RNA sequence: GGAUACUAAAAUUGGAACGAUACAGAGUUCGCUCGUGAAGCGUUCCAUAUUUU
């Protein structure tokens, strides 16, 4: 599990850990993380050593008969049904000494048809951009054309959207089998029209930790092709993270996050107001993801980026987007939605309101956003999208930002002091670069013109 | 007949402690020598948190 690397280095593939010397590698091998990885790998290896693969039995029969039959050959640990095909099964025996008892006789039968039992071959244990981006943008007309082309490139293709729809339909079918009358609402980066390649799909279940564990068990056992299922109650809204293998996707399933559905609807409505907010949001999201400020864990999530863009568009002297106060005022009949204490309403249609009085191009908006976000205070200034100004929060530090619909979650509470300072410095750098003349106009035969330096693979 | 399941301590950040690596500085008998750091790391400990939109 150790591979040699130059400079006298080593790499543990069991933990994916690179060490520059020998004592560090030895200390890592002496730690509890590597020991636990070894123990879990050995447990999986032993289970594979005491398991068999059964196929050939006729369809429309359950694995209960298989378990009852195999119980005659000693203790049986588990029987796992096939997923996505439903044609075979994996029988994990209790004791190793009984495995050969399964291998003693191959004359198997179930419902008349004959079967086929084999030893389980042990699969090897597994431990649990910037080229095309600069390629397909630098031949556009101007920076606005660059941002429009970036939107076109980052937009999910028909294949990805249809695949996500298929996943949603499968989840709905399974959960309707388990919970009749339930609905699986897709949302996240799928219905808000701000869809990027390799985005997260969130699934709201419309009908404490027991339900979360039940959903996790459903995903682990019955739902096809889904591995990496992790329940997470330690959050404002408990969520099951799930990964899907055949699609190579990863997403989140929530039970009570009803506000996020209307949040995604509002994001889509804001995107449909005009053809400039969407390019601005896509460009700023790409810039954040290309400068080490949008990743996993304590880093600024994709939703906070769109929230900041909407707030900035609200704060302009010519109102690009009316604030959430006006949006709530624009609501009509059948639009009295309110969840979790407070009320937040907005129209569900697009052609109901007045177009904005802004005419600035995309480059001007980007430069103004960079200047404003660089100059703004980060110590104790909380941004209110509902009122569209600056000054109920729960926890905040060097970054203050709350939802305009969920007025209790400070979405900026996932950024520490150093990350906030780096963000402010990057904003100042982008602002001065936009003020500089090189960014303002085109270079034909290669200079990294326009948005490319902001989108370059920097450090 | 038709392709051999992702089972506990799932993660990162704030503070830490210890062990090493770096020398645009110099020498060497080729063993290293003098002193100074957090770049990458490893081990362990305490978490008014996040990682979903
Ligand atoms: Zn290891």
Residue numbers in the entry: 7 to 134, 145 to 223, 337 to 520, 532 to 599
Could you give the paper's own sentences about this structure?
U6 snRNA is a catalytic RNA responsible for pre-mRNA splicing reactions and undergoes various post-transcriptional modifications during its maturation process. The oligouridylation of U6 snRNA depends on the internal four-adenosine tract in the 5'-part of the telestem of U6 snRNA, and hTUT1 adds uridines until the internal adenosine tract can form base-pairs with the 3'-oligouridine tract. Together, the recognition of the specific structure and sequence of U6 snRNA by the multi-domain TUT1 protein and the intrinsic sequence and structure of U6 snRNA ensure the oligouridylation of U6 snRNA.
Here, we present the crystal structure of a shortened hTUT1 complexed with a short U6 snRNA, representing the post-uridine addition to the 3'-end of U6 snRNA by hTUT1. Therefore, for a short hTUT1, we designed the hTUT1 lacking the PRR and the KA-1, hereafter termed hTUT1_ΔC. For a shorter U6 snRNA, we designed U6 snRNA lacking the 5'-short stem and the ISL and possessing four 3'-Us (U103-U106), hereafter termed U6_mini. For the crystallization, several cysteine residues in the hTUT1_ΔC were replaced with serine or alanine and one of the catalytic residues, aspartate (Asp218), was replaced with alanine. The N-terminal ZF and the RRM constitute a single domain without any linker between them, and the ZF-RRM and the palm of hTUT1_ΔC together clamp the 5'-single stranded region containing the AUA motif of U6_mini. The ZF and the groove loop (amino acid residues 423–427) in the fingers hold the double-stranded telestem from the major and minor grooves of the stem region of U6_mini, respectively, and the 5'-anchor (amino acid residues 357–371) of the palm stacks with the base-pair at the top of the telestem. In the structure of the hTUT1_ΔC-U6_mini complex, the 3'-terminal uridine of U6_mini, corresponding to U106 of U6 snRNA, resides in the incoming UTP-binding site (+1 position) in the catalytic pocket, and the uridine base stacks with the uridine base of U105 (−1 position, 3'-priming position). Thus, the present structure represents the post-U-addition stage.
